[model samples]
Target: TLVASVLPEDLAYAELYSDPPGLTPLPEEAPLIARSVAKRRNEFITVRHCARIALDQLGVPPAPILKGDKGEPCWPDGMVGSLTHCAGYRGAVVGRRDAVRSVGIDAEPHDVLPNGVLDAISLPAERADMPRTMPAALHWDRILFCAKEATYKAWFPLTKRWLGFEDAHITFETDSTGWTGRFVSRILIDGSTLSGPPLTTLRGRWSVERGLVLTAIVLA
Candidate 1:
């Protein structure tokens, strides 16, 4: 069954993974790590079943795709893509052949994050902006971290510039088109600047539902 959703706009196509077998796995990671070998095999089969829903979305065969040395998938020539998964959620993005210049997708759990983890992920200025009345913890930090991570993944295949959490910053401006995330940074990857009209037009969101975070970067 082709259980998938699609939103095609001009040169772009967006898909969300909800059915099983939709998420592509990393070559060697088992779905459930603690089970015995046979049990682990069963768990992986379950994961593969669910991951096919996403595979159907991308129009790819059911086998998990391998990642290149730079972590980019070996997508069919003339196409670019991104992949992400959380405890219960998995997603992928495939740009049209030679149409999408760059693409990225990410999801994170919606629960609170640990204080130490939050502290490490956020910039000093960003922390100052968090609500003092709200618990000083991980939710906000996780959102930002997820956004940056999505950005980095999206940016990696394009620029091949390795970036860490602290190298860039994000700000959100809500307009008629919902929330548009604007990223600003000083780091340059592969001599590619994350500046100018084309690169700076990145966007992201914190999924209150599904308890996940998401970010997508595309160059039109």
Candidate 2:
């Protein structure tokens, strides 16, 4: 799976599943899913099922994976993780906080972004450089969106502030291993400082497979 391909070996646990399991949420997580439509509930439950399995692998007991004020997953103490679900895919990756400061994973179908959507999310320089740097087979703009999403996921836990699509300028590297490639983000917060020392530049990896584009970022 694309998620698995980008995860570094140091992660304590990670798992990806194509099918949603028939599993119920723990008590703390029930209310969050109770009112959702069937499809939404299934996606919610399925990803958490992946999360539980990942937690179990780290020797942590299964527990409610609650949502934080910002709608991000609230992990068990001393743990950091991220979860993602898309058509025919669901996955989660986790690690002890001491082993890895934070992690984020995101996946999207391998397809073109809707007309004009790329202009809305990406900076001019990012869009201009794509054709020259990216292979024709890849939808570089869509991959930029996936990378930004993953970047937001990893950024929020450390700084609860919002990160707009244009908040970071991302650039991709040509050198790659198999289907994987690297990208770096220059966070442009308009000169505002984060709650913590701002991440000047965040590096991450991406891969395309099985009609999906997956991106991951880990902070240590």
Candidate 3:
């Protein structure tokens, strides 16, 4: 349900699961963690489980969702997709290459950032935009962090370069729905090589529920 609420209808195949029942990865993907610890293995297997289901919905055969040079998900050919996982959560969103240029999704616990982490990850303008007193229900700083993460995931597939947190500015807006709003992320650096046009703005949605905050962005 969280995925349905956060992702737009344009995404033809999307799947979300909490505490997924662990399943082994395909033979080709097993090398991704030939010697990693259990935690890493569990997360990898669980998220890919969701990815396979999404791909099936898209009518694509089950294939390994490998990691690319930048560690981003390498979706099947002719598809653009993203994968995410957090404590008690994992999700995948996929769309045909012709319909969607890229997709990104992230989930975080509804908690404040670790001490000193906020200053390291946020720009002065972003910090200044925050109210002196934080809201009781929504963690603004954490939301901004998640927004930047989703932005980077979506950006890498298009530009194939690193996108620093400060490389883009994010502004949040809320409506009558309480704790739910839209976010506009304006890329600050030159994005001429990106699949989209200049002055590219990534629009996304966010919501808080059951002690978790979810964010998603789909670029077409």
Clash totals for all candidate models:
14, 0, 0
Cand. 2 TM to true fold? 0.91
lDDT of 3: 0.80
CA shift at 30, candidate 1, in angstroms? 12
TM-score of each: 0.63, 0.91, 0.92
Highest TM-score against the true fold, candidate = 3
Model 3 ranges off by over 4 Å:
9-22, 132-135, 194-196
Candidate 1 Cα outliers beyond 4 Å, as residue runs: 1-64, 130-138, 174-201
Which structure among the candidates has the greatest lDDT? 2
Give one digit per residue, the lDDT tens place, for model 3 in 29-118: 999989989888888888888877888877889999889866878878898988887887777888887788888888888898989889
In terms of TM-score, which candidate is stronger, 2 or 3?
A: 3
lDDT score at residue 108, model 2, on the 0-100 scale: 89
For model 2, how does the per-residue alpha-carbon lDDT over 1-220 read when each residue is reduced to its tens digit? 4576666644654445555456777887889978899888988888888888888878889988999857889988988899988877888888887777778788888899989899888998998886788887898988999999998888777777788889989999755544568789889884233444557577888888888888999887
List ranges where model 2 is wrong by over 4 Å: 176-178, 190-197
Single out the weakest 10-residue window by summed lDDT for candidate 1. 1-10
